[PDB]
Amino acid sequence: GNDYEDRYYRENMYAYPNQVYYRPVC
């Protein structure tokens, strides 16, 4: 399985945040 922070690696790279968003900083 996997257990990260919020739940999974969502606070890193799940779908939305590729970097921050991706090109724009957010």
Side-chain angles (χ1 to χ4, degrees):
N2 63 327
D3 187 78
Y4 283 83
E5 197 161 13
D6 161 82
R7 177 179 65 120
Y8 300 150
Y9 52 9
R10 331 300 290 183
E11 303 298 80
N12 186 84
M13 167 76 272
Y14 69 96
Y16 272 78
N18 293 212
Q19 287 104 150
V20 267
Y21 265 177
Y22 69 105
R23 187 72 296 171
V25 295
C26 300

